[PDB]
Ligand binder design. Structure first.
Ligand SMILES: O=c1c(-c2cccc(C(F)(F)F)c2)c([O-])[n+](Cc2cncnc2)c2ccccn12
Ligand SMILES: O=c1c(-c2cccc(C(F)(F)F)c2)c([O-])[n+](Cc2cncnc2)c2ccccn12
Ligand SMILES: O=c1c(-c2cccc(C(F)(F)F)c2)c([O-])[n+](Cc2cncnc2)c2ccccn12
Ligand SMILES: O=c1c(-c2cccc(C(F)(F)F)c2)c([O-])[n+](Cc2cncnc2)c2ccccn12
Ligand SMILES: O=c1c(-c2cccc(C(F)(F)F)c2)c([O-])[n+](Cc2cncnc2)c2ccccn12
Lengths: 201, 200, 199, 198, 198
């Protein structure tokens, strides 16, 4: 039953241990679904956004036989390993608006979907034009290079109809960063939010 | 059995991280908002700042005790209990719980949690400064539990509403509804709360 | 018994999650506000930001010790004691506790907690800029314990900042109760009436 | 004895929740403010936002060790030590501690805590824009410990040259408060910050 | 040894509250700021709000393992590790850490911590609106560990192109503070940010 699955996850899950299988990186899939654009400052080039960060990976150490059991449970993220994802151009801490629970599937797949409100330093020039602003948000692992975490990406279906802004396009492009000190490459997703003020002349 | 024994027993049996589903039946969560205050409304950004009592009740039959010779209710910290992972889909701020985070547990295993919440929402503020007012829709449901695991059930709309708000309540309707994501067949149940209000 | 022994014994006997009801009786919680400052008033939104000392006392007789040859009082962190779940019904912010979260426990089992609280209320600010002033009513009771489990008992500008832009005309503290349609249970509150004005 | 042994001894003997009174004698807490910055002043609301180093020292002789062949000081998290429950009576914000919450424990049992605090006060800002300046009084004492348990014992060397304000004088005077109910006296330091706009 | 074994061993051996001094030598802390953004500048109050990457490295040799047949690096929560008690002497807000609080531990016992910090400083903003710009000096050192216990050593590539400011020059110079009372010297890095409005 659910209590047994959660008891077993709590005994075997190592929240502090990246679940690398053999020498393979953990494949972290990351998509933003934009829900709202709250505050835009064309002078300071800062945006306040709310997005669903759809995050999935496989931790095969969590797997169980579900032929005669539930094949999914909700688990507090404090009981699981979670990727140390960070937005490189964030200027506030991510504010998680929703309960900090992941779904764990019996094959060991983990789904985490926090609703995040966060402020970014990005190109706001053009927000009050027809072609709009393009704000680029770079999200990757802060401490795990490409041999440990790989980042995989997967338009306004969930965007508030009541925002003063409308979304023209969202592009999600794989990319990587390297710091001259070390040979290590860190994978990121570059998310390009092309948006503008509604109801211009 | 005295209060200390009831709380000792809850601490031994309660599994805060385990939904109390009885066989494969969903946990029936009842959710009502009582609006207490409307603090800030922005017609331009379509954002409201409200204070509401979220009356939340469910059954966790693993907590039940014989109360023929004991108290039939205790106050328990929610950190000792399983609580539904309810979230407002159109919230744009964290829920600010203004009150002590205690539930009442009844000897039949019923749990009552009534946080006073201050939160900001993105919703329709058009018409707020007119006679017929705005209608702001607040969608609250389980974030991670689909309809087979949690079912959400709604139940004098300004009985507790501050007479000192700049706004007044015309009507509150509470309608059952559900959300579904393209990927998956799973339905997540919500209550849609329709707050019809206006400037005084 | 020295201070370390009194604190060791409180830590063994205190159940922070268990209301200390003696022989089925409600716990008698005594609550007074002493207003220290009025920081921001908004006559348009009807909101006030205040600083007050919330003098709170009750009896937990399970904590009592023989003090004929011992200290008759210690300071204890409130995380080691049961504390009443008091809330202000018309608060629009969390209480911001400005002071160390310590109670005094007396050898007879009396507990004194006096947090300095900064909090915002929704209340009547009309008249603040007149001679007779505004009357802001702050309703404080137990959130979860009805009258058979907690009773709230009350007891003006002696400690009010001389440097506030406002001054206090009168504070009245009256017992009252709330009851919900659903249930016969009554929840006790103190209504505190702060009559103040701009200087 | 290495640092880990000194800290393991402190950790096993220190009772964070127990005031270290020797027999019936109060703990002598020494408190000085060193003003670092005056950030915001409001002559209408009479409110000041200040940054100060709160130099705090007392003795816990039960922690002492022989340091003839050992370090004579360690840094210890304050959560492992008893710390005086000091509060500013005219504070209108919670103290924002800007620095790591570590004390120094010296081998004779002296404890030194020097948090950098940013806090807002309700105090006399009248005269700030004049040559003789404002005098803002900050009362700091034990919140819960009367004079038989804690006694409190008391200018621009470190004041930011980039403040809009400058310090004319800091006075630190011992004082005490008493509540009508009870015979108990609570000791405080009154700190008088005489300052003005430059 | 796999990752789980190395992290289990670090968790068993780490002493978060014990400075890892090797022999009687100070711990060599290396500190560089990489400026990412300048958010708010106030030429009247002389206050700046900045975002920087604080590159911090030191050695804790007790954490070391044989990595000839193992991963030579893991990510560890800083709450499991000793971390230098670094503070900015002219900060006027708490450091706001924007990134996951994880360090890298290398098999030789080297620890790398790179928090992204947003913090407000009191410093010289005069000249920000001119061609030669302002020079804002940020002093960062150990708050509680003198020069015999911690030594601090320094060494627009990542600066946002979308700031309304631009960086002309960053200087990182070793320095020290001493308090008249005591012979103890506290080592700091003085970081000189020369910047201007675009
Ligand atoms: O967008 C989603 C998704 C979702 C949709 C598609 C793909 C993915 C995946 F992750 F695959 F990319 C996740 C979704 O599943 N939940 C339910 C959920 C949440 N947390 C954990 N488990 C389930 C919610 C709930 C609220 C809002 C958006 N939610
Ligand atoms: O600037 C850096 C560095 C870095 C670069 C040069 C020197 C040093 C050292 F440490 F040598 F000074 C560290 C870097 O390594 N990581 C990876 C990292 C993060 N946290 C902990 N350890 C490593 C990141 C990651 C994100 C942004 C900037 N990062
Ligand atoms: O609205 C309520 C209710 C209440 C009323 C009717 C239905 C429900 C239920 F929950 F049934 F829907 C709950 C109520 O009970 N408490 C007391 C309480 C609080 N928390 C926990 N248990 C009880 C309070 C207390 C303060 C303010 C509003 N309170
Ligand atoms: O008002 C008071 C009181 C006090 C005065 C009268 C009645 C009561 C009682 F509580 F009886 F109603 C308490 C007072 O006692 N302390 C000391 C104290 C503090 N906290 C805990 N215990 C004691 C302080 C300390 C600072 C400011 C105001 N304080
Ligand atoms: O002003 C001081 C002092 C100091 C100076 C004189 C008297 C006292 C005492 F406390 F004796 F009154 C303490 C000083 O020592 N430290 C080092 C220190 C820090 N924290 C804890 N212990 C020591 C610092 C560190 C930074 C800034 C100012 N610091």
């Amino acid at each position: 039953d659910r209590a047994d699955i959660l008891y077993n996850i709590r005994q075997t899950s190592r929240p502090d241990v990246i679940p690398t299988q053999r020498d393979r990186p953990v494949a972290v899939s990351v998509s933003l679904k934009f829900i709202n654009i709250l505050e835009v400052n064309e002078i300071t080039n800062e945006v306040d956004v709310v997005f669903w960060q759809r995050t999935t990976w496989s931790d095969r150490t969590l797997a169980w036989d579900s032929s005669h059991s539930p094949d999914q449970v909700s688990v507090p993220i404090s009981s699981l390993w979670v990727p140390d994802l960070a937005a490189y151009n964030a200027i506030s801490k991510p504010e998680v608006l929703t309960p900090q629970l992941a779904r764990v599937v019996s094959d060991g797949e983990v789904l985490y979907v926090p609703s995040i409100r966060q402020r970014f330093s990005c190109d706001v020039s053009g927000v009050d034009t027809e072609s709009g602003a393009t704000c680029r948000i770079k999200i990757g692992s802060w401490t795990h290079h490409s041999r440990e975490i790989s980042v995989d990406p997967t338009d306004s279906e969930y965007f508030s109809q009541y925002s003063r802004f409308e979304i023209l396009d969202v592009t999600q492009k794989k990319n990587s960063v390297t710091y001259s000190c070390c040979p290590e490459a860190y994978e990121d997703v570059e998310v390009s939010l092309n948006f503008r003020k509604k109801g211009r002349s």
